[PDB]
Amino acid sequence: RLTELREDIDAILEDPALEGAVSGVVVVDTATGEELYSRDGGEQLLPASNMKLFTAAAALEVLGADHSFGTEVAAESAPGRRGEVQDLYLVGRGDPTLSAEDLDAMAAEVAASGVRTVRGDLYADDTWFDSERLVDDWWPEDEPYAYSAQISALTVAHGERFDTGVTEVSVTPAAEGEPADVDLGAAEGYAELDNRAVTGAAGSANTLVIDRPVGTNTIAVTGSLPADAAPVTALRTVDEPAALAGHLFEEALESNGVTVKGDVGLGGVPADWQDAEVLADHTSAELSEILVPFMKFSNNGHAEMLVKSIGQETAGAGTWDAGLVGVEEALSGLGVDTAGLVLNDGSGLSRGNLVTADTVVDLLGQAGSAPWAQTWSASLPVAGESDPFVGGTLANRMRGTAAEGVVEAKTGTMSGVSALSGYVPGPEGELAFSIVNNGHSGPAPLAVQDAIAVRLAEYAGHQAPE
Numbered sequence: 001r002l003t004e005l006r007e008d009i010d011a012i013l014e015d016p017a018l019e020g021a022v023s024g025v026v027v028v029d030t031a032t033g034e035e036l037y038s039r040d041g042g043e044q045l046l047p048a049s050n051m052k053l054f055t056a057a058a059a060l061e062v063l064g065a066d067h068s069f070g071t072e073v074a075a076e077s078a079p080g081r082r083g084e085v086q087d088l089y090l091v092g093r094g095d096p097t098l099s100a101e102d103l104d105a106m107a108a109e110v111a112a113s114g115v116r117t118v119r120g121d122l123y124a125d126d127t128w129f130d131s132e133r134l135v136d137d138w139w140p141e142d143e144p145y146a147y148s149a150q151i152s153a154l155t156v157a158h159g160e161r162f163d164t165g166v167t168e169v170s171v172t173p174a175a176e177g178e179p180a181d182v183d184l185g186a187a188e189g190y191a192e193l194d195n196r197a198v199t200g201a202a203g204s205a206n207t208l209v210i211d212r213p214v215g216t217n218t219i220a221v222t223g224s225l226p227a228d229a230a231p232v233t234a235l236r237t238v239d240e241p242a243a244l245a246g247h248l249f250e251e252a253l254e255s256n257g258v259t260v261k262g263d264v265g266l267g268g269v270p271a272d273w274q275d276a277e278v279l280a281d282h283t284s285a286e287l288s289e290i291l292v293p294f295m296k297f298s299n300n301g302h303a304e305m306l307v308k309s310i311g312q313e314t315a316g317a318g319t320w321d322a323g324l325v326g327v328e329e330a331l332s333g334l335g336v337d338t339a340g341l342v343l344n345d346g347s348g349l350s351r352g353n354l355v356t357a358d359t360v361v362d363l364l365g366q367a368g369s370a371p372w373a374q375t376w377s378a379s380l381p382v383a384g385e386s387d388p389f390v391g392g393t394l395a396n397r398m399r400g401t402a403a404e405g406v407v408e409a410k411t412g413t414m415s416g417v418s419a420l421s422g423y424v425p426g427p428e429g430e431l432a433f434s435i436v437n438n439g440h441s442g443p444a445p446l447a448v449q450d451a452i453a454v455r456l457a458e459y460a461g462h463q464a465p466e
């Protein structure tokens with residue numbers, strides 16, 4: 001039954017949801033290298049979040065499994081016996097997992113080293129990366145949303161999920177007629193506020209909108225939230241992440257008993273300082289452990305940052321240009337043919353990326369025998385698993401099918417794009433697969449993708465847990 005499997009995929013692909021759509025599909029046995037199936041394998045397509053497959057691959061190469069990202073605090077000289085220090089610098093180096101308690105535990109160290117007073121200004125130094133925040137062809141109307149958060153070297157991640165450059169916004173109703181309450185989260189007194197929202201009557205029209213008007217740093221809230229409505233929480237992106245990190249640090253410094261007499265802003269370590277005094281540091285977890293919340297959940301902010309820290313290592317420049325050449329190179333050096341690949345970001349958000357499916361499977365093949373093979377696969381969403389940090393974006397897909405708990409694969413989906421590629425490990429040889437499609441008019445053909453993935457898990461020697 002190998003001819004018979006082809007019959008099946010051929011049929012699953014005649015689906016009426018793939019109308020006008022160029023789908024590209026490859027399936028490869030790892031152990032025997034035999035090509036199980038190939039349809040439009042060398043066609044050039046937009047890979048959405050599948051691009052992260054390449055990014056994460058090059059990130060383990062250029063940076064290693066053992067790489068950590070540093071964050072430090074700097075004055076000109078040690079703190080006065082009086083207590084006094086001048087201008088102080090919160091300086092990040094591309095930690096994609098920097099938290100609020102992490103900031104606070106840095107603010108401890110500044111107090112716990114003899115600082116009682118900053119008489120000067122507080123500066124945020126995200127100069128490890130350049131200040132180009134968004135890729136050329138990202139859509140301005142997407143900017144308000146998490147997947148489109150601005151790129152800095154020094155960005156405060158939010159939550160267990162380490163969503164970068166963002167703020168949680170809570171909107172609670174009051175009584176009907178009164179305007180709604182609006183919590184700006186971290187960005188309280190950093191981000192501007194326009195609150196035109198209102199509490200509507202009990203059980204009425206919920207028409208609440210949250211948006212950050214393009215090219216401002218105002219969170220703007222409109223519409224009605226009914227009085228009996230369960231409180232609304234929303235992640236929004238703020239302008240200049242690093243400056244918010246500076247603000248959250250001013251706040252951290254104050255509660256940790258350190259006065260700041262000046263302002264918060266952006267600015268670099270003057271370089272006209274000789275033996276600059278580092279009075280607080282912080283190391284992030286290793287890359288292997290950061291791969292988890294990144295790949296599992298498909299973190300965009302993370303990928304770009306990694307690209308930029310790749311350009312750092314190889315070239316000494318957190319540039320998108322620099323990094324992407326670095327991503328290109330690492331891949332080449334890993335044995336993968338980068339002919340059909342066009343690189344434009346690390347997250348695959350941009351519609352100016354291109355991958356062939358043959359290339360995906362190529363990379364899946366290769367990464368399957370690198371030293372970091374085991375950390376790389378640990379991070380890929382596992383099909384049908386309830387546990388968010390395991391299921392990832394495959395938590396509520398393929399449950400109770402041959403696929404469940406078997407298929408590690410990365411999703412990706414945009415208007416007009418979708419991909420699902422990864423491994424199907426079984427008794428009948430390790431399996432690598434790629435499913436990438438564009439052109440479809442309806443919803444992302446997840447039913448079609450799932451169907452292919454499951455049938456492979458069956459072929460590999462698997463059965464549904466019912």
Ligand SMILES: *[B@](*)(*)[C][N]C(=O)C1=C(O[C])[C]=[C][C]=C1O[C]
Pocket residue numbers: 048049050052147297298299347348349393410411412413414
């Ligand atoms: B890696 C999975 N990510 C995505 O599919 C994705 C979004 O999540 C819903 C949003 C925007 C882009 C995107 O992938 C490119």
Ligand SMILES: [Mg+2]
Pocket residue numbers: 185186187188189190247251
């Ligand atoms: Mg605040």
Ligand SMILES: [Mg+2]
Pocket residue numbers: 402403404405406462463465
């Ligand atoms: Mg099974």
